A paper describes a structure:
Complex I (NADH:ubiquinone (UQ) oxidoreductase) is the first and the largest enzyme of the respiratory chain, catalysing the transfer of two electrons from NADH to UQ, coupled to the translocation of four protons across the bacterial or inner mitochondrial membrane. In bacterial complex I the 14 “core” subunits, necessary and sufficient for complex I function, are shared equally between the peripheral and membrane arms, together forming an L-shaped molecule. All known co-factors of complex I reside in the PA: the primary electron acceptor flavin-mononucleotide (FMN) is connected by the redox chain of seven Fe–S clusters to the quinone-binding site (Q-site) at the interface with the membrane domain. In this work we address this question by building and analyzing atomic structures of nine different conformational states of complex I, which were obtained by X-ray crystallography and single-particle cryo-EM.
Aureothin, pyridaben and piericidin A are the most potent inhibitors of [name] complex I, while rotenone is less effective than it is with mammalian enzyme. All Q-like ligands studied here display a similar pattern of interactions at the deepest end of the Q-cavity, with the headgroup about 12 Å away from cluster N2. A shared feature between all ligands bound in the Q-site is a hydrogen bond interaction of a ketone group from the quinone ring with the conserved and essential for complex I activity Y87416,36. In the case of aureothin, H384 stabilizes its outer ether group, while M516 interacts with the oxygen in the furanose ring. The distal nitrobenzene moiety is surrounded by both charged and nonpolar residues that, despite the lack of direct interaction, might form a suitable pocket for its accommodation. In these structures quinone-like compounds are bound in the main “deep” site within the cavity, where quinone can effectively accept electrons from cluster N2. Most dramatic changes are caused by DQ binding, whilst Q-like inhibitors alter complex I conformation consistently in a similar way but to a lesser degree, to states intermediate between CXIINT and CXIDQ. The overlap analysis (OA) (technique described below) shows that transitions from CXIINT structure to CXIAUT and CXIPYR involve relatively minor PA rotation component (mode 8), which is much stronger for CXIPIE structure and is accompanied in addition by a bending motion (mode 7) for CXIDQ structure.
Numbering used by the authors:
A (entry chain H): 2 to 354
B (entry chain K): 1 to 95
C (entry chain 4): 26 to 205
D (entry chain N): 1 to 427
E (entry chain A): 1 to 117
F (entry chain 6): 16 to 181
G (entry chain J): 1 to 160
Write the structure that this text describes.
Amino acid sequence: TWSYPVDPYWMVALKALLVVVGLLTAFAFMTLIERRLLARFQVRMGPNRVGPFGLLQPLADAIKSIFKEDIVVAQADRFLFVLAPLISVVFALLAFGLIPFGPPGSFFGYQPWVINLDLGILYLFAVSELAVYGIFLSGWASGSKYSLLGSLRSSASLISYELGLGLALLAPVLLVGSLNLNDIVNWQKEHGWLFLYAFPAFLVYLIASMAEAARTPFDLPEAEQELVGGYHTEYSSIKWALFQMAEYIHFITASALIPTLFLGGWTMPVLEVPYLWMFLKIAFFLFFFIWIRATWFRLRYDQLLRFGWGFLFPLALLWFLVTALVVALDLPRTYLLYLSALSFLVLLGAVLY
Amino acid sequence: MSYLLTSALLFALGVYGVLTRRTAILVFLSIELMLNAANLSLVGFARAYGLDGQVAALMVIAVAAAEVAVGLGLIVAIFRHRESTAVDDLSELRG
Amino acid sequence: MTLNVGPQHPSTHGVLRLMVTLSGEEVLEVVPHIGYLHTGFEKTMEHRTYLQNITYTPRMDYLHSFAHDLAYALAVEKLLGAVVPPRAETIRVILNELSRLASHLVFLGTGLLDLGALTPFFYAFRERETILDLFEWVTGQRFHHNYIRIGGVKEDLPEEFVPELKKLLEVLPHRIDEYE
Amino acid sequence: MTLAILAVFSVALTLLGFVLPPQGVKRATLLGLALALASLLLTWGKPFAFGPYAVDGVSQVFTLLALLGALWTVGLVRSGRFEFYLLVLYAALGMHLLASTRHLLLMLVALEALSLPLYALATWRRGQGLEAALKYFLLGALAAAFFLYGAALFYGATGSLVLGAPGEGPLYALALGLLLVGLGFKAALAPFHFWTPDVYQGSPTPVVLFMATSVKAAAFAALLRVAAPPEALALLVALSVVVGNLAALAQKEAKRLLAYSSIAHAGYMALALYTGNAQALGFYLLTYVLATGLAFAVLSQISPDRVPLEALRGLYRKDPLLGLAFLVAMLSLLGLPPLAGFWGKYLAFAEAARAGAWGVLVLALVTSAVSAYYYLGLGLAVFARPEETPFRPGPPWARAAVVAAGVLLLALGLLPGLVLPALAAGG
Amino acid sequence: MAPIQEYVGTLIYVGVALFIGVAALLVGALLGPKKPGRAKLMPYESGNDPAGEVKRFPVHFYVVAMLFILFDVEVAFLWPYAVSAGGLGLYGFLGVLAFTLLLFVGFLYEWWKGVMR
Amino acid sequence: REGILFTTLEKLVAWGRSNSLWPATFGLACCAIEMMASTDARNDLARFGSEVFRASPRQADVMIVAGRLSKKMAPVMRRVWEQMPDPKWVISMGACASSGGMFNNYAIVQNVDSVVPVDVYVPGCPPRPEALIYAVMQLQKKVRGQAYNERGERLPPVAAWKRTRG
Amino acid sequence: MSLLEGLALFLLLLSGVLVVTLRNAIHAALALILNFLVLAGVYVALDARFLGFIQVIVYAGAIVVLFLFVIMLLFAAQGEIGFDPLVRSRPLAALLALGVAGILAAGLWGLDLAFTQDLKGGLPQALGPLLYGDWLFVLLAVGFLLMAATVVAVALVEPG
Ligand SMILES: COc1oc([C@H]2C/C(=C/C(C)=C/c3ccc([N+](=O)[O-])cc3)CO2)c(C)c(=O)c1C
Ligand code: SF4
């Protein structure tokens, strides 16, 4: 926060409240839109019911979720059973402020974001660990080892790719040299779209975000189709709703961070509108991701672990070494454009054999 | 200065744990608390003497990571087939 | 870990109980427990006339049922010496292979969904839906059709059956090639 | 730049063990350690410092001793696990870094780097070996916490974490005490000695050889850097010697008795700490290392898991050279003329009296005279009647090594004016 | 760098998120039929013993977590070089490369041994 | 609190529970494949709100007895019903479940109202997917209090609310 | 300062009391994570910023997570089995627990210190040239130590 102002604390509290309730509405309507887009994918059509376009169905879902006999299962830990959903929701809500939705004042006067910490990516990493925390804690608390093993699967796999997230996020820092997202986005305004320099690491970031229950390991797991997952299967009225809510908020926050960090956080080269381009890129990644949601299988978390550990992370640290050589000797930055273009051509042309 | 007194108090608390705790895991947790009390004192004295105690505490965290890894591997090796990790069940070696 | 992969849960289609004797992520050995659908065909059929039992036969294998109808029919035809008209035989092989396509569709859709992806369940099922219409054309029923008889089949094919069959037979090869 | 040799050999062999048989990795470790020892020889009198890494007489002497013990104990180890060799290399480097630095935090890193493999090397899988490993690990982590809060309070007394700082009053004393706790723990000083008998008794004999040579050498090498006040030194010496010898009287097992003996000898060595001579102490520890490595190589030829006192007996009839060497070693560990144990004892006692601490010195001497009870129950026992005892009379490797060690003990006892003139800069 | 005001704004962010989550918990818990049953409170799966009596879970998760702690320490050490990189020149670059090669050798060992175990 | 005691809120929560009916499948026999077919891309019960399908019983309100209920499965399914949150409904699908069906013997429960409280009965063999849509709409208006039987009575919103569990 | 300082110290001390008194291993580790959060906040208040972020990331995110992984693999929550209770040591330890504090308090009591240095926040921007440089030797030693730690644990468990 070298150059960025500070709104009063009451504005911070107000905007946080706005972000929380907007994330409610957002995840409800995104569940609707994902249903309908899946429908378009699998021929069938969606709920032209309670809406018309479905836009009163989240209300029915929320009203059903409450009054649903929120039960505390016996043979379960009285404390963690209740405490884990709150953890999973709290440590999911936050870490959305830093994503810049415009230049300062483009919130009709004050601030597009909430907080602009000096060290942002570390804050994101730290609160991202805590989602796995709530997952496996809730698994333990339920008193059902069928969910315990699912929680252990979740935590192991997510933790492997969560380590990989660090080797992914190293690459652009060497270039910019700042850990505040606004400086990084402004760098992406100057030279342009950081992934152009670091496309390989970009990949291993993107794929890493897929491991966080987004889809295609899909061995989080969910109770369905396999050794049942954790953090569910024992929660009835709101705590399950809180798990679904926090997991989807993590989904959409990650799908928004992917363009924010590597690609063009809003900051478009032309037409420079504050919010709309960020929202459209969020929707772009969401639509590609839903394509993936419909179109691909599971990974069984054995090949997933082997792939993350042996394949993603050595490759990411190799790219880190290359970029660190380039930055420390600082000779051009264009060499990185050339190398990333060649790397993408390799990782693409090797497909059509 | 209150922070360094608190570091000493946490050192004492980890000591009370290590003495009182029956299982290896809780003893090791108390030791982690002791090491972090030391880290707090190092951060204070780095604020007083110029920031080298911060990198010192960083290396301390690394040390804790290495010894946590090794201690948990050893614990598994001894008490995987064995019953409760309680060390009072191991009294073969006496003076 | 002698884990109780119970009847119908989790997603053991075709209610079946499993005691997976298993430590870890490997599989030592699975001990099965079945009978959770025992309804009594071998016994109830001893109290139903041969004509009636054609109502009990398809419902055992509810996916590929005309094989059950055909097995029962043929065995009784041999036992009392019945004559298959050529047209009845051709129709019986039509319904046999078509119910086989439907059973196969359901099998692969269930296999893909059971672990992995959800989408290809629908497309195959789409075709299955079309097939059912064909059956509803001649038998008036989706499945569990009581159409076959000891001598042959109940009554004749409608005028509208064959063109729909040609339509589905022309669209299908590309569809199966797509699945593969 | 011998540390470069150690790092290179360790890191290369770490992967090469996947392509090389344990025997090939063993021979490679032997070559690497021998080359590091030779590099130490060619660098005698060539001080070399880069950062906190500072090579002085202590560094050279004690790292030479540690490499000697490592080479010896590798000579005995033939297990089909390359890991059981790699750790040795690792421990070596670690102990090297312990003696070659003045930075307190780098001292902590070296303590961890040398202590981690030593926990695991004692796992012949015997349940008592695991009991010893757990006792060792927990008490060592406690001592690491103590040492760390001592380094923190040291930084509280001065702007640097390097020893040689002027130092304040009570806070500096407290910091130095909290450093001395862990360092003497590594050096088997009482009242921190409880781990030593259990660990020496539970672990396989060659591992205890490696311990009783290199651990004690490196621990005193790190101790000399500390400016320990004489009163705490008197407390440690008195408690160590008294309890060590007394409780060693009542012991029935060879390894446990010898661990108590090592406690008493660490109490004796701590007398040079009155003057911090580092010449006399280098010589003393050279003799003690040689003798104890010899004895434990023989004990390994007798029994890895545990050796009773009767097992030592009749060895001369079994092996002449081994019995002679064990007798000589027992007398040198008693510090008797004309053996080098007597020169080391005399040099430490001279430094202590020169500092003017009289009651402590006399008490150490009276208790060392008391020690003849078991020192003689061991040294002379070589000639007794062999009772039932498993006995594997070794290869020629260890026999020649034992012979050289004993000959050198007696030679440095007779004529110390050969090497002792060169334990300082090394003319 | 960044002012401390953003950090109290962070604390308020957390307090607001926590307060709204506790509010959602209150809404869920207070609104309900409240008819407990013995079988309802039973864990799962048809009579007893969904998993029931099983031996301790596989250690592979311990291996993964330990791997993660050591390599996350690695990443924490790599970050100060990530920010202050050009100021360290080829000397700092070469030092960080050696560090990375050492821990990558540790990975290479654990991989050539592999953990399917 | 049972979704009652307010002229507006009981209508609101009945609206919510009725439209957001989340089925808990218990696939047993050939009725259950006609239950699956009610979700494919020709005739899908994926519109009224039943898109998602909570396999766990702790999360779903509608349990559909879909197939012949063999006696060795009676108690398990019982507990599956007891493993449901209290605001739960049960539809009896098919002839084998509603009555004994054609299998009138020692192996089948001759009316599943024995083990579970049934909301709606739906005949057919198997009842056409469209009859299943009609039954879920029947239950929709039943839990709003918009259901009357042949005898002139309005039916309670939730069956399994009138039974002294034990 | 003191307004929130008292709160942070009370949370730290109460969390320590929890982690050393409670018999539930899970509750103890959880209280230790609450402790680390309070302590990273105190670090932040001490102008040590980067270290607090690593404290939350590494300690809470990684170490105690593995603690929880093992104790959930090996239940171990009901520790009081195979007691040999040794009741007298519970109050006696408190004595020693007081003692190991008192002498420390003596070293720090009557001690005034210069807590005045413009650290400008403990950012890694300034910690880099220290780490690679004056501390590079310790860094390389730490990295090799971590490699040795991996090898030790791997050769240690290695069922075969
Ligand atoms: C699987 O095949 C089969 O099943 C059954 C039972 C089990 C069953 C499960 C699920 C998971 C349905 C389901 C499908 C799709 C969704 N969805 O949301 O898309 C939801 C739920 C339905 O009938 C029987 C009896 C069978 O004999 C065969 C061959
Ligand atoms: S009513 Fe007919 S379709 Fe349904 S389970 Fe019974 S036999 Fe099968």
